[PDB]
Design a protein around this motif. Sequence first.
Motif, short mmCIF file in Angstrom:
data_model
loop_
_atom_site.label_atom_id
_atom_site.label_comp_id
_atom_site.label_asym_id
_atom_site.label_seq_id
_atom_site.Cartn_x
_atom_site.Cartn_y
_atom_site.Cartn_z
N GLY A 1 4.06 0.12 -14.85
CA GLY A 1 4.78 0.73 -15.96
C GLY A 1 4.47 2.22 -16.06
O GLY A 1 4.45 2.93 -15.05
N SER A 2 4.23 2.66 -17.29
CA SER A 2 3.93 4.06 -17.54
C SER A 2 2.41 4.26 -17.58
O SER A 2 1.75 3.89 -18.54
CB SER A 2 4.56 4.54 -18.85
N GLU A 3 1.90 4.86 -16.51
CA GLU A 3 0.47 5.12 -16.40
C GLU A 3 0.17 5.92 -15.14
O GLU A 3 -0.36 7.03 -15.22
CB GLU A 3 -0.32 3.81 -16.43
N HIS A 4 0.52 5.34 -14.01
CA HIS A 4 0.29 5.99 -12.73
C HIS A 4 1.49 6.89 -12.39
O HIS A 4 1.31 8.06 -12.05
CB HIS A 4 0.00 4.96 -11.64
N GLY A 5 2.67 6.31 -12.49
CA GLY A 5 3.89 7.04 -12.20
C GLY A 5 4.61 6.45 -10.99
O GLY A 5 4.74 7.10 -9.95
N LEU A 6 5.08 5.22 -11.16
CA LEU A 6 5.78 4.52 -10.09
C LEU A 6 7.11 4.00 -10.63
O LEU A 6 8.15 4.14 -9.99
CB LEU A 6 4.90 3.44 -9.48
N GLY A 7 7.04 3.40 -11.81
CA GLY A 7 8.23 2.84 -12.45
C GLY A 7 8.07 1.34 -12.69
O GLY A 7 7.05 0.89 -13.19
N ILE A 8 9.11 0.61 -12.31
CA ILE A 8 9.10 -0.84 -12.48
C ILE A 8 9.34 -1.51 -11.12
O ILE A 8 10.37 -1.27 -10.48
CB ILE A 8 10.10 -1.26 -13.56
N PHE A 9 8.38 -2.33 -10.72
CA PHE A 9 8.47 -3.03 -9.46
C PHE A 9 8.44 -4.54 -9.67
O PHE A 9 7.71 -5.04 -10.53
CB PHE A 9 7.26 -2.61 -8.62
N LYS B 1 11.91 -3.01 -5.86
CA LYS B 1 11.47 -2.14 -6.94
C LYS B 1 12.69 -1.63 -7.71
O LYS B 1 13.56 -0.98 -7.14
CB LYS B 1 10.58 -1.02 -6.39
N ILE B 2 12.71 -1.94 -8.99
CA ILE B 2 13.80 -1.52 -9.85
C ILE B 2 13.63 -0.04 -10.21
O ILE B 2 12.68 0.33 -10.89
CB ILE B 2 13.91 -2.44 -11.07
N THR B 3 14.57 0.76 -9.73
CA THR B 3 14.53 2.19 -9.98
C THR B 3 15.35 2.53 -11.23
O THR B 3 15.03 3.47 -11.95
CB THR B 3 15.02 2.91 -8.72
N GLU B 4 16.39 1.73 -11.45
CA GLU B 4 17.25 1.93 -12.60
C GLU B 4 17.89 0.61 -13.03
O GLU B 4 18.02 -0.31 -12.22
CB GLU B 4 18.32 2.99 -12.31
N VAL B 5 18.28 0.55 -14.29
CA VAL B 5 18.90 -0.64 -14.83
C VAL B 5 19.75 -0.27 -16.05
O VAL B 5 19.38 0.62 -16.82
CB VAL B 5 17.83 -1.69 -15.15
N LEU C 1 14.32 3.91 -14.79
CA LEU C 1 12.97 3.43 -15.02
C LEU C 1 12.04 4.01 -13.96
O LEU C 1 11.19 3.31 -13.42
CB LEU C 1 12.94 1.90 -15.09
N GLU C 2 12.23 5.30 -13.69
CA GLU C 2 11.42 5.99 -12.70
C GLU C 2 10.18 6.60 -13.36
O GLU C 2 9.24 7.00 -12.68
CB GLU C 2 12.23 7.05 -11.97
N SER C 3 10.22 6.65 -14.69
CA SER C 3 9.12 7.21 -15.45
C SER C 3 9.14 6.67 -16.88
O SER C 3 8.93 7.41 -17.83
CB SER C 3 9.18 8.74 -15.46
N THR C 4 9.39 5.37 -16.98
CA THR C 4 9.44 4.72 -18.28
C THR C 4 8.38 3.62 -18.36
O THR C 4 7.88 3.15 -17.34
CB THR C 4 10.87 4.20 -18.49
N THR C 5 8.05 3.25 -19.59
CA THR C 5 7.06 2.22 -19.83
C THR C 5 7.67 0.83 -19.64
O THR C 5 8.88 0.67 -19.74
CB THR C 5 6.47 2.44 -21.22
N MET C 6 6.80 -0.13 -19.37
CA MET C 6 7.24 -1.50 -19.16
C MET C 6 7.97 -2.03 -20.40
O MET C 6 9.11 -2.46 -20.31
CB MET C 6 6.03 -2.38 -18.86
N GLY C 7 7.27 -1.98 -21.53
CA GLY C 7 7.83 -2.45 -22.78
C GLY C 7 9.31 -2.08 -22.89
O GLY C 7 10.18 -2.95 -22.82
N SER C 8 9.55 -0.79 -23.05
CA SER C 8 10.91 -0.29 -23.17
C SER C 8 11.83 -1.02 -22.19
O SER C 8 12.86 -1.57 -22.58
CB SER C 8 10.97 1.22 -22.93
N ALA C 9 11.41 -1.02 -20.93
CA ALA C 9 12.18 -1.67 -19.88
C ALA C 9 12.40 -3.14 -20.27
O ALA C 9 13.54 -3.61 -20.28
CB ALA C 9 11.45 -1.52 -18.55
N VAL C 10 11.30 -3.81 -20.56
CA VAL C 10 11.37 -5.21 -20.94
C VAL C 10 12.43 -5.40 -22.02
O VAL C 10 13.35 -6.20 -21.86
CB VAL C 10 9.98 -5.70 -21.38
N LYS C 11 12.28 -4.64 -23.10
CA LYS C 11 13.22 -4.71 -24.20
C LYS C 11 14.65 -4.73 -23.65
O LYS C 11 15.33 -5.74 -23.74
CB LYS C 11 12.96 -3.58 -25.20
#
Length: 100
Positions: A31-39, A59-63, A68-78
Amino acid sequence: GSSGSSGSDIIHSVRVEKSPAGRLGFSVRGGSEHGLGIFVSKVEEGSSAERAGLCVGDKITEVNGLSLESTTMGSAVKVLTSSSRLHMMVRRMGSGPSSG
């Protein structure tokens, strides 16, 4: 003119459906910490993801357009859990790795 040759990186199209209870049909990591996105890590069995085309080793780059290249998991999850038709796009370079 422009001539072609050899393959190239292409985007993948998938459509995951919503669910009643239980994490998305697919399991994402990071998620948002290292800087990878959502995999993607795992993909529930007989789920909408597996049917949507989502599998392990992506690896999900966008949805839903949302990057989601620099977003947190939560937000993504939501958002991932907020919609009746998610449109996730992964970036493949080729080859086929294995787990273990």
